[PDB]
Point group: C2
Chain length 138, copies 2
């Protein structure tokens, strides 16, 4: 078997992350198809259909039965390298594989960074408003 | 950033295991050379030059400066699959790699087994002698 950190590169693992996925036989966005497109299922109490690309970290919910996950991935995250990987996992060279895993580690940092920015800016607006209000109480 | 279990497949890791190795520049069995041939350094108080193939688990000590580790590996463990791997690590496919790692896992078991056999036979010798000594009476 393989290290936990790398399991998501495996289609079978990705599929196994969907336990109560609602869209099964009859639907375009099945687990096989969500997984082939790179998604993991990471449902919340608030969004029980939330999926994430394991590679670029894009999150999507609001899935409908006729939705094609490849098309949707390609719409919301056109830059994602995974969409270029033509080869099956075992046909990859370790060099190719390690190269992918560095891009994924960069994409993860970028996601954490872009989050911290947003939270920072929300905080900064509160503090600015609070000080503005006090200068005004005048 | 690779899993501890798999590091020994990397030449630079293998070299790093040689800290107190006596045969350095000028010698045929340097760390670069020991490492290229598959060896890790696993010295004991009793055998400070003990080296082991990471892949087939063969152990060798009694190293001399003109010794070529590939030639020694071939001589004592001719069956070892690692001696066939012509490609650099990164040029391997994951399939090829996973295939190698299963063979290594089998080799390890076989060695644990060949150890347990030897310990068993040593214990049996002791018991035999003990019964012999008493029966002399
Ligand atoms: Zn993606
Ligand atoms: Zn060997």
């Amino acid at each position: 078997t393989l290290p936990p950190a790398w399991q998501p590169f495996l289609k079978d693992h990705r599929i196994s992350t969907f336990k109560n996925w609602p869209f099964l036989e009859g639907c375009a966005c099945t687990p096989e198809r969500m997984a082939e497109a790179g998604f993991i299922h990471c449902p919340t109490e608030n969004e029980p259909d939330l999926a994430q690309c394991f590679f670029c970290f894009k999150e999507l919910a609001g899935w409908e039965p006729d939705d094609d996950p490849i098309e949707e991935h390609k719409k919301h995250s056109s830059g994602c390298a995974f969409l270029s990987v033509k080869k099956q996992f075992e046909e990859l060279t370790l060099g190719e594989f390690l190269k992918l895993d560095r891009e994924r580690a960069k994409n993860k940092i970028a996601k954490e960074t872009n989050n911290k920015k947003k939270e920072f800016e929300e905080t900064a607006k509160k503090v600015r408003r609070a000080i503005e209000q006090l200068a005004a109480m005048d």
